[model samples]
Target chain A: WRYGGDPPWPRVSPACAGRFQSPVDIRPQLAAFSPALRPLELLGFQLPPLPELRLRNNGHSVQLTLPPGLEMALGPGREYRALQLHLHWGAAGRPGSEHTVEGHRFPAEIHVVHLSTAFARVDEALGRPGGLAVLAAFLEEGPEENSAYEQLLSRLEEIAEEGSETQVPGLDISALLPSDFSRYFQYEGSLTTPPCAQGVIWTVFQQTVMLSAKQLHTLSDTLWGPGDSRLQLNFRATQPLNGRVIEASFP
Target chain B: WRYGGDPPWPRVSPACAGRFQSPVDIRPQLAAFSPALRPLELLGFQLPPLPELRLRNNGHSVQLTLPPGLEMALGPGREYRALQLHLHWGAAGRPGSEHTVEGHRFPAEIHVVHLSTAFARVDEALGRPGGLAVLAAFLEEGPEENSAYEQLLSRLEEIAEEGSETQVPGLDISALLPSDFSRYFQYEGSLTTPPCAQGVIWTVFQQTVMLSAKQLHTLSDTLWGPGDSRLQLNFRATQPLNGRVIEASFP
Candidate 1:
């Protein structure tokens, strides 16, 4: 029992030391590596040939996009410059969620999290582990002309069942990300994924994204695997406040 | 049924359009007013009396104050500035809460929202529906020696639970207000209360507060009353986004 005890849960407090908890700044650590505490290496993902995926656009005024499928989450974490994106959905109404602030949730959300990489990772010369950045965007239902989204869902009845769902070609993943991402609230939190690593300096850009109702419906059906419960949710519950401080890039 | 005519709900898309948006630089209609838009005049509220609260350094940490019998809520449609404050509470086993942000419900929370008085009167200003601000503070159960809060709860218990609870004696309302509130994130949202108005700008400071476990228990029991749900959840559900841009503030 004394062997490998459970990982330590993060501290849940109001203020985390100072005003700014510089995230992605492993650069400082990297420039002067402390014998240990090595930084994570970045690796690009190789994808299979692209495919077609048809989705649903419901009576919802806003249309959502068809799932980008498994290939979507393949990008490297904490590396690369921004631009170009897509969606990752499941068989149910809700699935891909793992972040929350002030206890608020979007019916479903997409994080086109990206890095600037300009200051570091370039072909020129020096670099630091400190150039890390991520953008957390949120999505919700709305009333509008989601004709773009509807076109996808109109075909959902065909592959609404489950596994090996079809993919829709020509849809741009970049549309799902936000514009002018420099403005964001940054703080040390945890990865939305497992291992729940503490001190993930999160850069939650305050941007409300849009998706067509059809696109949303297409994602909903798949979250539950075709003929299953409509998965309307797409996020994980927020974690505890283990003495952490979340901040944004504005005043 | 035909005699009743149309409907009460805002017609779908139009409803979304008419929805009150926030983060608006709410200037009074003043003489320079819009012909199409209606000017606001009054916001009714019997402002709570100001409390003189101060901090005292105990052996361990600093001591914040809150007397025995006063429980208050942020005004319905007005901004709340940190006035003076203190704490109030009960035993170690029980706890109390008034609001729930996402759904993870904390044992308790805090409110530090304030109004921008640069443009209007606290009474007439709030009445006319002018500018407003508030800080939501969340409190969790913890150590002992949370003296000041204990006093606030003891007195708050007496008046806080009565019909239409109002301010009471020995209630040092100022004990809970933050001293140097320079850092925060400001967003456009709704009243955490009903009427559930959607124009209030929320600025939740990135810090937390502390209170003795005993005082929290006392506060909880008093609000819900005997036999009622032991915990008094004061949070309202998150509302739909009707084309609102959330703004933020920081240090």
Candidate 2:
């Protein structure tokens, strides 16, 4: 299946035509600063050096399967278990971030997807309201190379082809995210990709994660997509806000 | 004048919410290659080296007013007179071409807008069907600098601030466009910007115009937008095709 069709994406998936969608252009000035929103808390992000971690190129993106032990605490009663983490990126010189800030597209974006602990399996909570929570962070170029990203990027070549899979040693996954967790934009929307499952809670951090220019090129140029084309710009365009309120965790 | 709001752009301009929109992703594989589509014919694009051309930074983009003598002959009796030309781009590291090809975005895009010769004034032709035509081309990074683009880029500093205007020496405007006019995608859509008047004839060339990386940076980084922020990513997101058939000149 390709992105283009006779009627396009909305006809294939009805929910894609819904009011609320993910990857909206975030306007910090228009967002309501909510003091009620608390800083995000992650648990079990520092994984042991195990080679069981699976890195797969799923034609669309390079995804890493995460263990269920990884969890996030949104509130006292709100807990979510990690499902998987993936990236969206553009070409070697182009920024492929799904979300944009003030219409600025970043080099890349990382989405750490999780399911509400209320449901035992992701399928059970797939379309339920507040069933899934996605922690997203933009990736920008830095002066120096990021050692943490090297752990996963080093194995990208092994899974370069679509449907290809490989095993990589697990490292501190939290290091891949932004350091500041207090400042973020929150909204209720759907998944960025096909199926576009709605009611997914989104939290996009204000602080961007740092990666070297060379590392970014690797992430963007390493994988192959459908029809054996180089996998690049695997990001959905920013959707219309449709009167959705974006709440910021910081004032 | 910002891109974000409660209901976003559609509420601000009802035409933006219309069914037929420009800058839709051009899926060449899904398009019907039509032998009936002929090579585009240009007339009077070569301008004399005079400082008559006006370059203005209209906050949203840097626009260059074209001479009325510049015209495009779509067919035997169909003609369009050039009005103005402008660019849509992302930052130094981002791809901001308004139209994406197989989901790949180039660094920038140039749009040369024209009005049907049947209308005496643009206002008279504004909302009429096939009243306007836009010739667009993607700008990609090349090893060598494009001398023709330098005529504009060298003057970007003069129009760095929003609402700024300047006069630049006229050059061969045709040199800025793709040499291969035989390959392009044709569609009926609306203007990309707000007050997105419909009934526009669009022709997006397959061959991209080349520019040096430094030139691309100058185009993206030189200008400023509202609140004195850097003007970047002026291109709109790719709209849905909505069952519109895209006809290509080449297979």
TM-score of the A chain in model 1:
0.48
Candidate 2 chain A, run of 10 with poorest lDDT: A1-10
> Which lDDT values do the candidates have, in the order given?
0.36, 0.84
Candidate 1 per-residue C-alpha lDDT over A1-251 given as tens digits, one digit per residue, 9 for 90 to 100: 00012322223323223222322221111121111111222223222224543333221111233232212211121234432232334333443434444444444555443333323322221111112333455555666644544544455555544333444554444444455454444444433333233323344445655665656666565433223344333233444443333333333
> How would you encode candidate 2's per-residue C-alpha lDDT over B1-251 as one tens digit per residue?
45423346787788888777878888877886655466888989999977589999998899999986998966433578899999999996798999999899999999999987756778856655557889999999999999999999999998898999998878788899998988898887888888888768899999999999999999998999877588898888888876567878786
Off by over 4 Å in 1: A1-251, B1-103, B112-115, B118-130, B164-174, B178-180, B224-231, B241-251
User: What class would a CAPRI assessor give candidate 1's docking?
Assistant: incorrect
Q: Give candidate 1's whole-model lDDT.
A: 0.36
Q: Compute each candidate's TM-score over C-alphas.
A: 0.32, 0.50
Which pairs of residues collide in candidate 2?
Answer: none
lDDT of 1 by residue, B71-144 (tens): 22222112233322222222235332333334334455554333443233333223112234445555665675
